[PDB]
Amino acid sequence: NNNIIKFDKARFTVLTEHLIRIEYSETGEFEERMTQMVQNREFSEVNFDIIEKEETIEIITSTVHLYYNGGEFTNASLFADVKFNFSVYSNRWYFGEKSDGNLKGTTRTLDMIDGECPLEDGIMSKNGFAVLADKGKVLTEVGDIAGNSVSTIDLYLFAYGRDYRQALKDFYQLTGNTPKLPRFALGNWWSRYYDYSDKSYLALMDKFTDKKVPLSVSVIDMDWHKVSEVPSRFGSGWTGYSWNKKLFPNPENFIDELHQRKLKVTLNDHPADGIRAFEDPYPQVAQTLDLNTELEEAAKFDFDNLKFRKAYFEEVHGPLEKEGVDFWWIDWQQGAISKSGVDPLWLLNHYQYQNAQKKHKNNIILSRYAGPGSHRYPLGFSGASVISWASLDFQPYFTSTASNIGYTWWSHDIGGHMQGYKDAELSLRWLQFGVFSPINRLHSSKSEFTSKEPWHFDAVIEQSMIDFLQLRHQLIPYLYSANLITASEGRALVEPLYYEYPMEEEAYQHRNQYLFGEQLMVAPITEKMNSLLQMGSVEVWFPEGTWYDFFSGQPYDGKVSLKVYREITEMPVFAKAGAIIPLDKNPLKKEEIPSEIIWKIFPGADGEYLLLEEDNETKAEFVNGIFTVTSKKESSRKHTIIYGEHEIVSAKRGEFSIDLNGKEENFDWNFSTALFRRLDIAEISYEQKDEILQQLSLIEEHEKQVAFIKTNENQELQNSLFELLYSGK
């Protein structure tokens, strides 16, 4: 109440020094209930100043002057000056107007998108302020829609400057934290829009095992249910709740077989045509909803309706869950229309996520983005992207930017969904990105030609895809720990560079570069390789410090912007001196938590990593060359230590300390080996290869080696050779 100020028909709540709620009420009553967006307005007390006159009020915090001159809210009556100098004259908010600087957020879907699409604003701005309008309905205490707010205007002014992480934390305090994901969500998912039988689906799952590809999730797409068998008088077979008995004669037994293989099972649900008279559950639903069965009255989709929702969860989903379905893929594409004015997609995500908690702890959905606050209902499902280099090139930027509206669990169709064109290299680059994305779900539309099975491709592509898919399971400990940090501390797994480096202009100029947890920096390659080099490339910004390629140990002295080149089988991922990354030593081994962890240490600085698990916390410390591992609880877990290049300790039990000061710090990576490899794969003249190898071996002074490559007629070859020289300086 000390942090609440009324003036004329407005109410101002100073939630933090940098977050002010702004309300208008014609009725003099202001809204206390939660909304679709807002779950909590309880914040600790803060200091601020007021200048209140007859006709005007000014609220003053450490970061903003908010002015209200009375009357209806207009661009003239309600406005704010930030106490920052990030811009020369973009430091003022005017009610109902847009200002420059917004770093954007996300959008509902990538359905039908070939490359870039427009995004909605987020809460982050380079100029230090953003306004988030609450246009949603009020909730009841139990979380049903209650109707219109009595605050007919309800806004949140964010004035955090470039303290982006704190803005996001306080956003999560206002809108509710992201829930914890279950560990199974972080493994590889198999999905394909393909009319598998029980037999061919299990045969494929057993082929994954034979091929050494680990999976956590078995998606079954819409051909699980009747499609062509639906009489046309009912409409299409898009919506379905009845097994196709030719393909799945015993569904519970088939799901039992996936459960024996330690897979979680989800089915595609297209809800929009509801429960029509041909469906297996229709007799029960018709009885519950008092439908006219002799006129074959449909139970039309109506998620505003309590009785419909109950029948949907209990009598439609319920029997399928009893057969063993673990969680729901809500695949909604039929618009934003409802009686209530609430988006049916929001109603589905809110009510289905809540219903999923009844049968499994920390359960998920898979569904499209439903607006600010819908991060409460993971996972995000971006949908039917066009298969193209342009779509891949948009996706890292899309994924990191989404953290700016707190939606940090986007699952993209890895390799793209539909249409587009075949290029095995595009498929491989997309999988590299997916492995370093929130969720790694392989999926494809209905084409005989778009399977994401590694063995679809040639032996080189296949082996690389298998390697990356195994790496995803090696990363599950790191991902799961980051997941618990999202849930408990409001930190995104994927951060734009500018979260960590807000004052570095280069942190705003590398759209596809991101931080992946706290220990890794990713620069995916999203452009087709230069055939003369047989290598793809990306311009990488290296912050201040010593950086190592995560895979090769190639070093880079920051701060620098440097074009980096990789073969199609290799991905630019970097770790700082002192980085500690845990890996599952046994990624193929079915076990709910790893029996063995590899501690991968990057020499040259102190470091620390906290491994959060379901029932433990394990701290790895690297201080003055001493590596120490301690846990809250004891276990039989065996620890492996890799210090730079070399395995130091193999499968050691319990807590321990070891001195690595007397151990080889340097990786093997060396200029001459790397130079020989780049020249050898290049589709260039042998006389050019001979001369470059000879001259770069003979010329001793680094500045003269660089002068020699500066004369090369191949401009991209110059850049590739320059990367090696820079790493070898």
Ligand X SMILES: *[C@]1(O[C@@H]2[C@@H](O)[C@@H](O)O[C@H](CO)[C@H]2O)O[C@H](CO)[C@@H](O)[C@H](O[C@H]2O[C@H](CO)[C@@H](O)[C@H](O)[C@H]2O)[C@H]1O
**To which H or E segment does residue 659 belong?**
strand 656-659
Residue 2 binds a second copy (CB under 8 A):
no
What are the backbone angles phi and psi of residue 610, rounded to the nearest 5°?
A: -105, 110
458 binding a second copy? (CB under 8 A): yes
Quick one: what does residue 92 bind among ligand X, a second copy, none, with the CB cut-off 5 to 8 Å set by partner type?
A: a second copy
395 interacts with ligand X by CB under 6 A? no
Closer residue to ligand X in complex, CB, 193/457: 193
Tokens of 705: 């080696």
Choose, by CB under 6 A, the member of 23, 134, 198, 221 that binds ligand X.
Answer: 221
Residue 12 corresponds to which tokens in the numbers above?
């101002």
State the number of binding residues for ligand X (CB under 6 A).
13
Give CA–CA dist 105/98, Å, rounded.
Answer: 15
Measured between alpha carbons, how far is 9 from 71 in angstroms, rounded to an integer?
A: 7
Report the site for ligand X in 442-471 (rule: CB under 6 A). Answer: 445-446
CA distance 271 to 266: 15
Q: Which does 222 bind (CB under 5 to 8 A by kind): a second copy, ligand X, none?
A: ligand X
- The Cα 329–Cα 574 span in angstroms is 34
Give the span between the Cα atoms of 300 and 283, in whole angstroms: 14
CB of 396 to a second copy, least distance (A): 20
Minimal distance, residue 112 CB to ligand X, in Å: 6
Beta carbons within 8 Å of 235's beta carbon, 6+ residues apart: 273, 276
Q: Reduced to 3 states, what is the DSSP secondary structure of residue 629?
A: strand
Taking the mean position of all CA atoms in its chain, how far away is CA 294?
48
Q: Is 88 in the site for ligand X (CB under 6 A)?
A: yes
**Smallest gap from residue 219 Cβ to a second copy (A):** 43
8 Å CB contact between 576 and 545: yes
| 536: contact with ligand X by CB under 6 A | no
Strand partners, 442: 190, 414
Encoded amino acid at 621, one letter: E
Residues near 28 by beta carbon (within 8 Å), at least 6 away in sequence? 9
Of residues 69-108, those binding a second copy (CB under 8 A): 69, 75-77, 81, 89, 92, 94, 97
The two tokens of residue 727 are 């790493």
Which tokens is 37 given?
């967006």
Tell me which residues in 103-122 interact with ligand X (CB under 6 A). 112
Name which position in 13, 87, 152, 334 contacts a second copy (CB under 8 A): 334
Least spacing, CB of residue 535 vs a second copy, in Å: 13
Q: Is 292 in the site for a second copy (CB under 8 A)?
A: yes
Question: What residue 339 binds from ligand X, a second copy, none (CB within 5 to 8 A, per partner kind)?
Answer: a second copy
Of the candidate residues 6, 199, 212, 422, the single one contacting a second copy (CB under 8 A): 422
Task: Provide DSSP, 177-239.
Answer: PPPPPPGGGGSEEE--SS---HHHHHHHHHHHHHTT---SEEEE-GGGB-STTS-GGG--SSS
Q: For residues 352 and 345, what is the distance between their CA atoms, to the nearest angstrom?
A: 10
Binding segment (CB under 8 A) for a second copy, from list 146-154, 160-168, 294-302, 477-485: 294-302
Q: Supply the minimum distance, in Å, between the C-beta of residue 13 and ligand X.
A: 35
The answer to the question of residue 677 lying near a second copy (CB under 8 A) is no
What separation, in Å, do the N-terminal and C-terminal C-alpha atoms of the chain show? 62
Mode of pairing for the β-strands spanning 380-381 and 410-411 = parallel
CB nearer to a second copy: pick between 534 and 616: 534
68 near 78, Cβ under 8 Å?
yes
Count of C-beta atoms within a 10 Å radius of residue 447: 14
For residues 316 to 345, the per-residue mask of contacts with ligand X, x marking binding by CB under 6 A and - elsewhere, is ---------------x-x------------
Per-residue binder mask for a second copy (CB under 8 A), 399-418, x = binder: -------------------x
| Shorter beta-carbon distance to a second copy: residue 337 or 503 | 337
Is residue 162 within 8 A of residue 503, CB to CB? The reply is yes
Tell me: does residue 273 bind ligand X (CB under 6 A): no
Q: Which residue from 225, 226, 208 is spatially nearest to 217, judged by alpha carbons? A: 208
Judged by CB under 6 A, does residue 244 bind ligand X? no
Is residue 610 at the binding interface for ligand X, with CB under 6 A as the rule?
Answer: no
Distance CA 470, CA 155 (A): 46
Considering only 354, 447, 586, 616, the residue that binds a second copy (CB under 8 A) is 447
Stretch that binds a second copy, among 329-337, 474-482, 580-588, 602-610 (CB under 8 A): 329-337
| The one among 297, 500, 504, 596 contacting a second copy by CB under 8 A | 297
Question: Rounded to the nearest whole angstrom, what is the least distance from the CB of residue 51 to a second copy in the complex?
Answer: 5
Q: Which of 184, 193, 282, 397 binds ligand X (CB under 6 A)?
A: 193
Q: Which of 63, 125, 268, 391 binds ligand X (CB under 6 A)?
A: 268
By the criterion CB under 6 A, which residues form the site for ligand X?
Answer: 88, 112, 193, 221-222, 268, 331, 333, 383-384, 418, 445-446
